[PDB]
Amino acid sequence: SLNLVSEQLLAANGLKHQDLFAILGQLAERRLDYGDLYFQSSYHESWVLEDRIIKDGSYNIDQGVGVRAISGEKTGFAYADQISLLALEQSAQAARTIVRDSGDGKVQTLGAVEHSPLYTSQSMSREEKLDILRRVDKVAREADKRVQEVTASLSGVYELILVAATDGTLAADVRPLVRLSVSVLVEEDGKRERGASGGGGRFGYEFFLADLDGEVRADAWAKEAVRMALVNLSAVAAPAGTMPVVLGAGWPGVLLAEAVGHGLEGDFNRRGTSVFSGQVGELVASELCTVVDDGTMVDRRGSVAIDDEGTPGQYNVLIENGILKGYMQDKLNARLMGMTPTGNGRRESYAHLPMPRMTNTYMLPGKSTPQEIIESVEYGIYAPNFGGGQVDITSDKFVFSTSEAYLIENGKVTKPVKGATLIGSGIETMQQISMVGNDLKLDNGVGVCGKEGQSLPVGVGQPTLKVDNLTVGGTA
Amino acid sequence: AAAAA
Amino acid sequence: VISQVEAQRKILEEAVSTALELASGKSDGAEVAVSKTTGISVSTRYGEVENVEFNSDGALGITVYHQNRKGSASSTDLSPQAIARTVQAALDIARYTSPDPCAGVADKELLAFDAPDLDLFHPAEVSPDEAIELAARAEQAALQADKRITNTEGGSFNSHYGVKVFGNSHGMLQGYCSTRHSLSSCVIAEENGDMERDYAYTIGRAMSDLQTPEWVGADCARRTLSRLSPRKLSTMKAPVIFANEVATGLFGHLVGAIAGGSVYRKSTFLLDSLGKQILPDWLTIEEHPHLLKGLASTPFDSEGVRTERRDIIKDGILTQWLLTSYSARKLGLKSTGHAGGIHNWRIAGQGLSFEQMLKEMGTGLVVTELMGQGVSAITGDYSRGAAGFWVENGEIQYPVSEITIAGNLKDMWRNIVTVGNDIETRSNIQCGSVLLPEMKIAGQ
Ligand code: NA
Ligand code: NA
Ligand SMILES: [Zn+2]
């Protein structure tokens, strides 16, 4: 696997392992803690169905090398949209100017080690791909006469990476990723609404024609987009104020993944700018709460067989029975905090710097049934789906908008309600969790996380859970 | 610090 | 720098001509866009260099058309062999997509064959050390302001130049150069265990248009200290002022609601509002695509179509949609030159300062920062997280946070009371603060 990637990224571009030694040597002329070379090539394809036809398709290619020189807090960085000896030399000579002082030159010998495989290394025909989209269109339109528009898309990426560093690290990965997305519009008596579904992971397109609880997966997802659209078409104004909120299993995990997960990234905590800074050993959550970030999940969108620094993905317990245990790291922030790498050093591409980032972030299951949770609420909201939102990790605020939600009245789910924005404090919200369900699920393969302008594929999850008090931004 | 589906 | 840029421009013009000629024998039409961006991005921490990043980014994109079938491809490699591969990839896709008569190269009569020079290019030779000193001065000025500033997210400085060339199979081939420079800082203050963060910035096409580093740091400290010890308001109904910096975004929600893509699909709450008075009868929104040095000025849109001076809103009335070639064709209309977005919006003040607006409102909420999504394109429903200040007796009393503001855009826009003379001048849309009579505030 290292051999196969090396042939494509190095040998095919006129490079050998001794060229890596020479360029790392150029970096180590300066007084540095670390330097690395990061090689990448990818191909992306898409196909889109709309207005009952195959309307569009695209094919996008990128390739390049990025070079870093690191001393304490400091990083110098340069890169090129090509893989060649000249690009490496120019990039290294720019990056190393971060420090003027001479170094001892003593790098560690490059040596690769094994890691666990987490995903495979046209697999389907063009007409078979397009038949997935045609099937989604047919099933969605057949589901209800009010369905007027359907947009369905297929996206696929095949990515190769290789990293070599002054600490001896030599590592490679082969990364597939596919996504099916469906959006529908419904109309009745001049009123219109929309609904959406989809997912995927690190495998081929055949996943979309496999079984999901007795039906073809693509059919199930087409029907779900229609179901969502019709709920929204019927929904009435949401109430306003502080009340109990039951968050559904799966994608609603984005709210705490974002608020708490970003809060526990090591860059913020090393600088002291997170509300969680210096709090290891303290009760930051209800004793019912255990939160993990898990890079090891076979075939998942959010997983990392290695991260972008060559560190294998790990199962990291962040909060355990309410107690803060520690932080997600990259190599730079681990050194400065006196800690070790965790498998969280990720970069959008060769043209961007790595930093501490999430993989698959989720809360562990507890002892309550979802029915028991709903039956405990006299008046509140049940929120099984969200769009997106935003967080402030310094003052500890999150803001997330519902995409499917209902009143709870006298222990029963009742009327569907319109998009409402929930706002609160991450720590206070975790301390308000009084019931944790036995029904853990992750999202279907849809997560996108942004930090400092860099977007990455991630996972989120949780069981059903009860927040005793949370501010709901409705109108009624 | 902004996520979505 | 100027010799480097002209060398890049020649290479890019050749890349466009090469791609079009390779496409010409095997397609009915084609569109090609290329760009190159180069510069530096630096940061500081406690006034010392932190990051130094050298930027160099290229891109080529092509769309081809045959029998009304479309296909697209892109590459960051601009070698002739990579261009050839990219053209072939787009042609291969268009063999399999379906005929769609609204797709195709923009109408020849609308193209900017002789595009105007809008003076967007003002290069600077700033060394990494010079860049670091500007960022350090800004961060240091903020940190020195007050002993309650106990942490930092750093100083930042960016300086870049770009070149863009567009061509198509009607014979258009035009390009232009541009620059952008910016300077910012962000610090953290604390009071009684509660931390807050805020930032300040300056931006321009020329270095000599920027505020000083000391101005940036002073503004950053002022903003950050003003946030300390906020209250969470109780649930209520009250008047709301959108401060200038968020009022621009309030008008910004119009763009999605009048975009041709949403109009032809019937996915906008303004579907039945062309020619209707949706804003106050004294309010006009002016678009100015050809302002010299303008932050969002452009000599042609992303399809090569000419950009025009237009009043999108005139005396409260919605006068037009924002169309591209495809959405115009769906509606039986012509492109309005909006492929890639809007091009400098201007809204005049009605005479009052911010202070005078506080006095008029008397008691109510000022919002200065908004968070989250929370705006429905199809219904107009609005619910966003907010931070700002509570006002009583015409005076700011304390900062507030952890609240939402909610309403519907149709009612919010129609009932605007006034717009201030305190114009925000660093953005695409430029206006002052905006007073609304009532919103639903959710809190305790
Ligand atoms: Na393992
Ligand atoms: Na031709
Ligand atoms: Zn995120």
Author numbering:
A (entry chain A): 2 to 122, 127 to 481
B (entry chain E): 601 to 605
C (entry chain B): 7 to 450
What did the original publication write about this model?
Using a combination of biochemical and crystallographic methods we show that E. coli TldD and TldE interact to form a heterodimeric metalloprotease. Both proteins are essential for the activity; however, only the TldD subunit forms a novel metal-containing active site within the hollow core of the heterodimer. Peptide substrates are bound in a sequence-independent manner through β sheet interactions with TldD and are likely cleaved via a thermolysin-type mechanism.
We have constructed His262 and His267 alanine substitution mutants, of which His267Ala was not folded correctly and His262Ala was catalytically inactive but, surprisingly, had wild-type Zn/Fe content as determined by ICP-AES. a We have used a two-part dataset naming convention comprising the TldD variant type (WT, wild-type), plus a shorthand for the ligand bound at the active site, where PO4, phosphate; DRVY and HPF, sequences of angiotensin fragments; Act, actinonin; hex and pent, adventitiously bound hexa- and pentapeptides. N.B.: details of the H262A-pent structure are found in Figure S7. H262A-pent peptide ligand was refined with occupancy of 0.5.
